[PDB]
Structure formats: C-alpha cells, structure tokens
Write a structure and sequence with these properties.
monomer; alpha+beta; five-stranded antiparallel beta sheet; two-stranded antiparallel sheet; 2 helices; 36% strand; Papain-like protease nsp3; viral protein; SARS-CoV-2; SUD; SUD-C
C-alpha cells in the first residue's frame, strides 16, 4: 500500500513543513513524527501509525498535519 511508500519518504527527508522526524523508544511505540509535546508513533511489520498511543490511518494523519 502507498502509505508504506510514504514511510520511506519520511526517512529520505527527515522533516515535514512544520514537523520534525524522530525515532526514540516509548511505551506507545517508536516515535516517527514530533512537534512540541505532540508525537506520532509506529510499530508493526506492515504500514502503521498512531497519535499518543491510539492508531490512526493516513486520513487521520493528513488532517492532523494540515
């Protein structure tokens, strides 16, 4: 799926518009997007994303940045 192709684009660029790219270990997952106290995490083998330990899709991510 194309979300898993975006996960690679994260690693290529090391930031977005107004958001920093990460990778610290937490009780919620591994960090992979950061802005102030707000963090998005990932942990699986396929594509996966969560805000503050609760899972979201690209739809719920895309408005979370925009």
């Amino acid at each position: 799926g194309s979300e898993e192709h975006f996960i690679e684009t994260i690693s290529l660029a090391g930031s977005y518009k107004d958001w920093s790219y990460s990778g610290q270990s937490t009780q919620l997952g591994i960090e992979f997007l950061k802005r102030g106290d707000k963090s998005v995490y990932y942990t699986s083998n396929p594509t996966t994303f969560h805000l503050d330990g609760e899972v979201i899709t690209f739809d719920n991510l895309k408005t979370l940045l925009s």
